[PDB]
């Protein structure tokens, strides 16, 4: 049951489901995972071609992921705040 090409997005998405997220957070999450997926493959082309030799294009992925993990608390804080 994987909706993304990378295990990180599927694991994140499936984990979000595991956290019992509401359909809205799962829908918003899927959108962010899709954007993160496309950006991650497109950027992987950048990193593989030699475009992100400084961590600037991936910075958007690391930040977008942190934004998703901050919206769902998938791989970060999970206590109170």
From Swiss-Prot:
Superkingdom of the organism of origin: Eukaryota
Molecular function GO terms recorded: amyloid-beta binding; heparin binding; lipase binding; low-density lipoprotein particle receptor binding; receptor antagonist activity; receptor ligand activity; signaling receptor binding; very-low-density lipoprotein particle receptor binding
Post-translational modification: N-glycosylated.
GO biological process, one term: negative regulation of receptor internalization
GO cellular component, one term: endoplasmic reticulum
Subcellular location(s) of the protein: Rough endoplasmic reticulum lumen; Endoplasmic reticulum-Golgi intermediate compartment lumen; Golgi apparatus, cis-Golgi network; Golgi apparatus lumen
Record disease entry: Myopia 23, autosomal recessive: A refractive error of the eye, in which parallel rays from a distant object come to focus in front of the retina, vision being better for near objects than for far.
Subunit-level organization: Interacts with the LRP1/alpha-2-macroglobulin receptor heavy and light chains; the interaction is transient and coincides with a reduction of ligand binding by the receptor. Interacts with LRP2/glycoprotein 330. Interacts with LRP1B; binding is followed by internalization and degradation. Interacts with LDLR. Interacts with SORL1. Interacts with LRP1; this interaction is followed by rapid internalization.
Name of the protein: Alpha-2-macroglobulin receptor-associated protein
Organism of derivation: Homo sapiens (Human)
Portion of the full-length sequence here: 51 to 131 of 357
């Amino acid at each position: 049951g994987e909706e993304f090409r990378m295990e990180k997005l599927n694991q994140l998405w499936e984990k979000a489901q595991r956290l019992h997220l509401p359909p809205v957070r799962l829908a918003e999450l899927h959108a962010d995972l899709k954007i993160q997926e496309r950006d991650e493959l497109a950027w992987k082309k950048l990193k593989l071609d030699g475009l992100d030799e400084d961590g600037e294009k991936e910075a958007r992925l690391i930040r977008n992921l942190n934004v998703i993990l901050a919206k769902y608390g998938l791989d970060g804080k999970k206590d109170a705040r």
